[PDB]
């Protein structure tokens, strides 16, 4: 396993530099020297937060997977807690997105309150309070267990009904409701976008919604390529679990190596903003 | 980009019947209003819909067509007046992209006589 010991730590460290530095440079820019233009700003300033935690809480991570782990109980269950906040905060915060050009877009007449008031007062209810009340079973099972030579920093489950319930509702919620959301919502503004001739009334406010619009659906695609094969791998691995998928015990290992490696370079999600901002800031 | 150019003009006689040619073709992702001014002023216009909005000089006079398949825009002529001897400009109105705002367009021109 010498191939994995080397290749964990190196993406690892790499996801997290970037990250840290993007990130505070978004933060930074957008918080304190005021380069805010619109709600997309600030949906973008809550994923720099969120990804700004979760890259902070990587290096333990490298540790872990370089020797072993000398951090702590405590520790463990606060590393898996900003995990799933970051995870459940992010893939809803692109749906928020979502919600807003598909307001922004179709309904063009009187969408000022319902794009104002769903920014600045309910952002917070819908993605922060369900995260981090989806936290709980981070509290609950996240432990340090005292196998021999290491010591592992992840979740024990008492049993793997618990285990495969727990994959099952991470990627329902995760893939499938903000996919469902972003489907619709992108589905109808590009149906818009091929029909309409001059959306709103004048042809700037028409090419302006073209240029903020455009942006979101690069970040959305992707955010999905990146998250795609890890919750594919994992898919199989729960079919594994419940007695569907039976082969030689090649497949067990095959798939093993298979999730984390795809677990690794899906970890490339936290270092799309500042790419993007890279790409289209000329 | 994409081109549009000018057919169907010369020397003929009055009470005559010809049919103005304009084809589009190139980096064509929509066209949305194809139309014929004369300063501009509007002759005749129609939408991918078939909404004409005809002019006031030419009401129940000129006769528009368009065919998406080909992306032309046909004008028929019929009795002819003296006063309607004048050069045409082909307008059409075109998309490059999803993403990309509404860009306006013109034609080379068409020269239609009428004998005296």
């Known amino acids: 396993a010498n191939f994995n010991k080397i290749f964990l730590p190196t993406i690892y460290s790499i996801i997290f530099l970037t990250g840290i530095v993007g990130n505070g440079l978004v933060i930074l820019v957008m918080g304190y020297q005021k380069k805010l233009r619109s709600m997309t700003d600030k949906y973008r300033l809550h994923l720099s937060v969120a990804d700004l935690l979760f890259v902070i809480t990587l290096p333990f991570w490298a540790v872990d997977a370089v020797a072993n782990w000398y951090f702590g109980n405590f520790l463990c269950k606060a590393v898996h807690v900003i995990y799933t906040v970051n995870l459940y905060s992010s893939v809803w915060i692109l749906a928020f997105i979502s919600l807003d050009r598909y307001l922004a877009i179709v309904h063009a007449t009187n969408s000022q309150r319902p794009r104002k008031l769903l920014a600045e007062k309910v952002v917070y209810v819908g993605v922060w309070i369900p995260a981090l009340l989806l936290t709980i079973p981070d509290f609950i099972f996240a432990n340090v267990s005292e196998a021999d030579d290491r010591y592992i920093c992840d979740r024990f489950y008492p049993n793997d009904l618990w285990v495969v319930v727990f994959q099952f509702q991470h990627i329902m919620v995760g893939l499938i409701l903000p996919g469902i959301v972003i489907l619709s919502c992108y589905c109808i503004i590009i149906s818009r976008l091929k029909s309409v001739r001059l959306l709103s009334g004048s042809r700037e406010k028409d090419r302006n919604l073209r240029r903020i619009t455009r942006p979101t659906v690069i970040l959305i695609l992707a955010f999905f390529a990146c998250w795609l094969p890890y919750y594919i791998g994992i898919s199989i691995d729960s079919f594994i679990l419940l007695e569907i998928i039976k082969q030689g015990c090649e497949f067990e290992n095959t798939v093993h190596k298979w999730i984390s490696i795809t677990e690794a370079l899906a970890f490339f999600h936290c270092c799309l903003n500042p790419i993007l901002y890279a790409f289209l800031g000329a | 980009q994409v081109q549009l150019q000018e057919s169907g003009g010369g020397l003929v006689q009055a009470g005559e019947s010809l049919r103005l040619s304009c084809a589009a073709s190139?980096?064509?992702?929509?066209?949305?209003?194809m139309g014929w001014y004369r300063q501009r002023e509007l002759v005749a216009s129609?939408?991918?819909?078939?909404?004409?909005k005809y002019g006031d000089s030419v009401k129940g006079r000129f006769t528009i067509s368009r065919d998406n398949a080909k992306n032309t825009v046909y004008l028929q002529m019929s009795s002819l007046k003296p006063e309607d001897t004048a050069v045409y400009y082909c307008?059409?109105?075109?998309?490059?992209?999803?993403?990309?705002?509404?860009?306006?367009?013109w034609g080379q021109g068409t020269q239609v006589t009428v004998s005296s």
């Open positions: 190139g980096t064509i992702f929509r066209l949305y209003d």
């Open positions: 307008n059409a109105e075109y998309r490059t992209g999803i993403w990309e705002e509404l860009l306006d367009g």
């Open positions: 129609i939408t991918s819909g078939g909404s004409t």
